[PDB]
Amino acid sequence: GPPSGKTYMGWWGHMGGPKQKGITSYAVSPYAQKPLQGIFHNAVFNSFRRFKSQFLYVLIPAGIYWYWWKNGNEYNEFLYSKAGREELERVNV
Amino acid sequence: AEVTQLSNGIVVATEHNPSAHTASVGVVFGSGAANENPYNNGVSNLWKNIFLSKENSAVAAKEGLALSSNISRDFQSYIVSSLPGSTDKSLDFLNQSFIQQKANLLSSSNFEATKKSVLKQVQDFEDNDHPNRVLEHLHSTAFQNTPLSLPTRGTLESLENLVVADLESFANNHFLNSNAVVVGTGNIKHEDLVNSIESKNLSLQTGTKPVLKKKAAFLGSEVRLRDDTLPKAWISLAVEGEPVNSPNYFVAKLAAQIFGSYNAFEPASRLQGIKLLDNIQEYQLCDNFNHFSLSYKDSGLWGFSTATRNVTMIDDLIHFTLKQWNRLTISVTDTEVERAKSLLKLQLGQLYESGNPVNDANLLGAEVLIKGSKLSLGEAFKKIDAITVKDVKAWAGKRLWDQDIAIAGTGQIEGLLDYMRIRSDMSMMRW
Asked whether the beta carbons of B419 and B316 are under 8 A apart, the reply is: no
Instruction: Name the β-bridge partners of A26.
Output: B223
Spatial separation of the C-alpha atoms in residues B329 and B392, rounded to whole Å = 7
Asked whether the beta carbons of B32 and B74 are under 8 A apart, the reply is: yes
Terminus-to-terminus CA distance in chain B, angstroms?
A: 56
Spatial separation of the C-alpha atoms in residues B415 and B309, rounded to whole Å = 11
Single out the residue of B286, B284, B307, B290 nearest to residue B235, CA to CA. Answer: B307
Asked whether the beta carbons of B45 and B118 are under 8 A apart, the reply is: yes
CB atoms within 10 A of CB B66: 16
Spatial separation of the C-alpha atoms in residues B217 and A79, rounded to whole Å = 81
DSSP state letters, B162-207 = --HHHHHHHHHHHSSSTTEEEEEEES--HHHHHHHHTT----SSTT
Give the CA distances from residue B179 to residues A3, B9, B28, B88, in Å, rounded to whole numbers and listed in that order. 68, 11, 8, 23
Spatial separation of the C-alpha atoms in residues B304 and B325, rounded to whole Å = 11
> How many angstroms separate the CA of residue A26 from the nearest CA in chain B?
4
Structure-solving method = X-ray
Asked whether the beta carbons of B235 and B415 are under 8 A apart, the reply is: no
Q: Which stretches of B4-87 are DSSP H helices?
A: 43-50, 54-62
Which residues, including other chains, have CB under 8 Å from residue B174's CB and lie 6 or more apart? B29, B31, B35, B76, B210, B211
Domains of chain B from N-terminus onward: 1-202 (3.30.830.10), 209-431 (3.30.830.10)
* Strand arrangement of the beta sheet that strand B288-295 belongs to: A25-28, B221-226, B406-411, B233-240, B300-308, B288-295, B261-263
Q: Helix, strand, or coil here: A6?
A: coil
Q: Helix, strand, or coil here: B249?
A: helix
A50 and B CB contact within 8 Å: no
Q: At what angle do helices B249-259 and B389-399 cross, to 10 degrees?
A: 90
Spatial separation of the C-alpha atoms in residues B317 and B324, rounded to whole Å = 11
Nearest CB neighbour to B420, from listed A14, A30, A32: A30
Chain B residues with at least one Cβ partner in A under 8 Å:
141, 219-229, 311-315, 404-405, 412, 414-415, 417, 419-420, 423
Single out the residue of B68, B59, B71, B61 nearest to residue B104, CA to CA. Answer: B59
A9 and B CB contact within 8 Å: no
CATH architecture of the domain with residue range A1-93:
Up-down Bundle (1.20)
CB atoms within 10 A of CB B71: 24
Angle at B88 between CA B84 and CA B94, to 5 degrees: 110
Spatial separation of the C-alpha atoms in residues B58 and B45, rounded to whole Å = 20
Single out the residue of A28, A29, A13, A30 nearest to residue B226, CA to CA. Answer: A13
Asked whether the beta carbons of B26 and B94 are under 8 A apart, the reply is: yes
| B410 Cα distance to chain centroid | 22
Nearest CB neighbour to A20, from listed B141, B226, B419: B226
Residues of B in contact with A19 (CB under 8 A): 228-229
Phi, psi of A92 (to 5 degrees): -90, -20
Question: Any idea of the CA torsion for B90, B94, B96, B102, to the nearest 10 degrees?
Answer: 150
